[PDB]
Amino acid sequence: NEVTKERTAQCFLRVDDESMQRFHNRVRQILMASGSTTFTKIVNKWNTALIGLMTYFREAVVNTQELLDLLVKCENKIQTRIKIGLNSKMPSRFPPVVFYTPKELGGLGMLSMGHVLIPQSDLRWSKQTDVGITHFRSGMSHEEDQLIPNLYRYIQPWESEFIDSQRVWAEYALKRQEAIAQNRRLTLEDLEDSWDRGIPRINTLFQKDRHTLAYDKGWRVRTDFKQYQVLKQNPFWWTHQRHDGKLWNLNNYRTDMIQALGGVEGILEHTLFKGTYFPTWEGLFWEKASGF
């Protein structure tokens, strides 16, 4: 309550059944339209759908156990489709490093909203030096088999989002009102701690086209109605990256996914990288398409 400032009510959230049906339909049409389609395109479509669902319905997944089951089922569907694409026979002990490797390291970079364990035997690599060939494991920790980080923990809940947004906007208002008097523009220096916090993300204040965007009105309604003009459904039908900013950061998720897989060294041990005899992994780049 805004007067008693007490916990007068409790709000339980859930993902609507229509939204779950729409997500399942989107995954089904992703999969069935994959007879002649690259694996990376399929994984990117799945990743886009998953981030749209999880960012839109954060705090509402946890209470919808049916949604968790549907999510893991669809992720298994995607993995099965990719595995069938590789070979026309189901692998028995397929490893997760192929799917959950970031695309720059050659992997598919699929986002996992589930629970996938990496077998310990897949966290060992070997390196040849002048003395001989030495073997390395990934972690000194004596725990269960490594679990890839779950996207669940890498999205801040809406309640925290709104509280943080209110605090950040109050701080920004105070800074602006105390900087008008001394006559200095906010120069990105004091607005560094509160960088990706407010719902109209502070990055939008410093956006390049921040003047021409101010005359763009009714953009949420236009984004929602865009489904009647473009042949492709938009997972982010509700927000605009330019107007609203980026509401989710995958830097930490991908950081911990690289960390969990044993790092670049182990991931490349799973690959042909050492078979290329490249002295290091730093000064290298990919090429998406060949000349022909």
């Binding site: 968790l68 893991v72 298994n76 996992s112 589930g114 364990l117 669940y152 923990r153 890498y154 930490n252």
Partner: peptide, 22 residues
């Protein structure tokens, strides 16, 4: 070690959503 994705229903309730993020 099967390579299949497991459903995290009834799992990892000791962790929040705002954790492991700065």
């Amino acid at each position: 070690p099967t390579g299949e994705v497991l459903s995290l229903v009834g799992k990892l309730e000791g962790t929040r959503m705002g954790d492991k993020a700065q």
